[PDB]
């Protein structure tokens, strides 16, 4: 809410309401570290979040013309 932060483009991204409580959702550095958010084969459970990955890999995907 401070205008030194609300101006100065390098930092006013923090004013976006998608950044309320980043440390409660795991969006700080230690949060993403504990969520497992890293690239590559060692992180196949956790790159897009493992509950999202689990839902993708446990969804049955049916088309109109069955495959």
């Amino acid at each position: 809410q401070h205008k030194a932060i609300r101006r100065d483009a390098r930092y006013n991204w923090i004013c976006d309401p998608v950044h309320k409580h980043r440390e409660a959702r795991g969006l700080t550095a230690t949060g993403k570290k504990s969520r497992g958010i890293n690239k590559g084969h060692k992180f196949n459970n956790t790159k897009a979040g493992r509950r999202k990955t689990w839902k993708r890999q446990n969804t049955l995907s049916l088309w109109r013309y069955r495959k």
Partner: protein, 193 residues
């Protein structure tokens, strides 16, 4: 239970899978909306052709290295050899990939030729001027297509030197199999006296 002569099945439905059944009833609706998005985006980015120019690259993984395909972007070296800079190429419709490198002169020359063909076939509008409209063509991919390079002619002379070419595979397999043990044999012969 297990009963008569049937294949043993592996149907994975011992979770609550019915909470996670996606049926794609919206296939036609999402097609209508993707076409609507393409039309709306085309009208927003009038005359620009709705996709960037992509390079031709060789696909990895020896199952697929007989094919070329569209890659992500042109290679800073390819952009410089075509005669422009990367930060200006990103503004006139060329995809630039800073993280691929060239180790193939044929792929490099194909992409420099692709870039020079593109620069001859585009009309860059003046930045502040009248800029008369140049009739939007909607796709760079269908007007600079990815062509598989010709590797041989249809007919040649038979040049059989009697190498027998199955023996070539057998011998070349054997040198790889025994390279290390006989390099070590050679060095322990060298460690005599």
């Amino acid at each position: 239970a297990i009963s008569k002569n049937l294949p043993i099945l592996k149907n994975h439905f011992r979770k609550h899978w019915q909470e996670r059944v996606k049926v794609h009833f919206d296939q036609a609706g999402k097609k209508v909306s993707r076409r609507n998005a393409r039309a709306t985006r085309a009208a927003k980015i009038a005359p620009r052709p709705l996709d960037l120019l992509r390079p031709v690259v060789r696909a990895p993984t020896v199952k697929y290295n007989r094919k070329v395909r569209a890659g992500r972007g042109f290679t800073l070296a390819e952009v410089k050899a075509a005669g422009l800079t990367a930060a200006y190429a990103r503004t006139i419709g060329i995809a630039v990939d800073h993280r691929r490198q060239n180790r193939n002169q044929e792929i490099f020359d194909a992409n420099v030729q692709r870039l020079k063909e593109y620069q001859s076939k585009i009309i860059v509008f003046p930045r502040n001027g009248k800029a008369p409209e140049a009739e939007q063509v909607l796709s760079a991919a269908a007007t600079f297509p990815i062509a598989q390079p010709a590797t041989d002619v249809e007919a040649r002379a038979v040049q059989d030197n009697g190498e027998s070419a199955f023996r070539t595979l057998r011998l070349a397999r054997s040198e790889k199999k025994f390279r290390g043990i006989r390099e070590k044999r050679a060095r322990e012969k060298a460690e005599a006296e």
